[PDB]
Design a protein around this ligand. Structure first.
Ligand SMILES: Nc1ncnc2c1ncn2[C@@H]1O[C@H](COP(=O)(O)OP(=O)(O)OP(=O)(O)O)[C@@H](O)[C@H]1O
Ligand SMILES: Nc1ncnc2c1ncn2[C@@H]1O[C@H](COP(=O)(O)OP(=O)(O)OP(=O)(O)O)[C@@H](O)[C@H]1O
Ligand SMILES: Nc1ncnc2c1ncn2[C@@H]1O[C@H](COP(=O)(O)OP(=O)(O)OP(=O)(O)O)[C@@H](O)[C@H]1O
Length: 129
């Protein structure tokens, strides 16, 4: 599923990401925009043999199991395929674990490089949530 911007904002808010660990909703929408272009099915392989999955590009070395990543830890205790669903629940639940882990949203490279410190509230402007 390719979400619209306000559609994803509303879904993320329904699933409890607004201000989760102090990160406002626009941070999460901005991260999804630049990680996956709002496409739940996005997958991208990394140099180390892991792959990133879903709307928030969660990686198979630490967070989910894809059966092909040496040293997989599966800290979200989920198959990576679950992070590709049209229903964002599994991605949200895993993202909540990631952002609680010490580095906050710096776990998402696209957030660090394209969202952090910017006017992220713009990502929810005009939306009826
Ligand atoms: N009665 C239920 N039976 C089974 N699962 C449930 C039930 N109520 C809630 N859930 C679980 O809640 C998870 C997420 O909540 P829910 O499906 O209600 O979100 P939503 O508001 O429809 O989401 P979105 O706004 O993204 O469409 C679902 O994956 C489902 O597993
Ligand atoms: N892949 C990553 N996963 C999680 N946190 C990360 C990752 N890469 C960087 N960070 C953290 O994000 C924050 C900023 O990252 P960055 O690499 O830019 O900072 P740094 O090397 O500590 O120095 P500076 O920000 O001063 O240039 C730091 O806390 C860094 O530890
Ligand atoms: N400062 C830290 N010291 C030790 N372990 C840490 C630290 N920060 C995070 N971790 C743990 O390291 C593992 C990877 O966390 P991290 O936030 O770096 O993940 P990631 O951004 O998805 O991966 P990567 O850094 O490989 O790109 C998790 O178990 C996290 O709990």
């Amino acid at each position: 599923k390719v979400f619209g911007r306000c559609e994803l904002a509303a879904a993320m808010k329904r699933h409890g990401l607004d201000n989760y660990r102090g990160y406002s909703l626009g941070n999460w929408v901005c991260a999804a925009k630049f990680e996956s272009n709002f496409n739940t099915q996005a997958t991208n392989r990394n140099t180390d043999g892991s792959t990133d999955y879903g709307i928030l590009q969660i990686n198979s070395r630490w967070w989910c199991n894809d059966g092909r990543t040496p040293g997989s830890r599966n800290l979200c205790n989920i198959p990576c395929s679950a992070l590709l669903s049209s229903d964002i629940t599994a991605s949200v639940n895993c993202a909540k674990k990631i952002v609680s882990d010490g580095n906050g949203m710096n776990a998402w490279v696209a957030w660090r490089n394209r969202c952090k410190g910017t006017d992220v509230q713009a990502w929810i402007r005009g939306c009826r949530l």
